[PDB]
């Protein structure tokens with residue numbers, strides 16, 4: 832109900848969106864899909880199925896989980912998978 836994109840709540844559905852993911856991008860679909868993200872079909876742009884947070888310009892060593900907590904800390908999917916303690920840790924850096 833509060834989920835932004837219901838058709839993207841499964842990991843499998845999120846993985847299917849990466850068919851046209853440019854292989855030049857250093858961050859892999861598995862890492863993104865695990866962290867709630869699916870590809871929206873432009874550039875390297877992804878969104879979270881739950882909170883609708885959008886991220887782009889992925890560089891090597893970027894951790895989608897950490898980016899999720901940094902920019903979109905009140906996402907329910909993030910809080911339930913990784914825990915509020917994790918979200919507080921990341922927020923405590925920046």
Ligand SMILES: CC[C@H](NC)C(=O)N[C@H](C(=O)N1C[C@H]2CCCN2C[C@H]1C(=O)N[C@@H]1CCOc2ccccc21)C1CCCCC1
Nearest residue numbers: 871875876877878884885886887888889890893894898902
């Ligand atoms: C994702 C990790 C990446 N590491 C270099 C990163 O930090 N990306 C930033 C990023 O993705 N951001 C930045 C933060 C600052 C305030 C909120 N922003 C969220 C995110 C972003 O720019 N998202 C855009 C906003 C417009 O809507 C969409 C839609 C889909 C995908 C991305 C976005 C930003 C970096 C500078 C160049 C543009 C991208």
Ligand SMILES: [Zn+2]
Nearest residue numbers: 879881882906
């Ligand atoms: Zn989210």
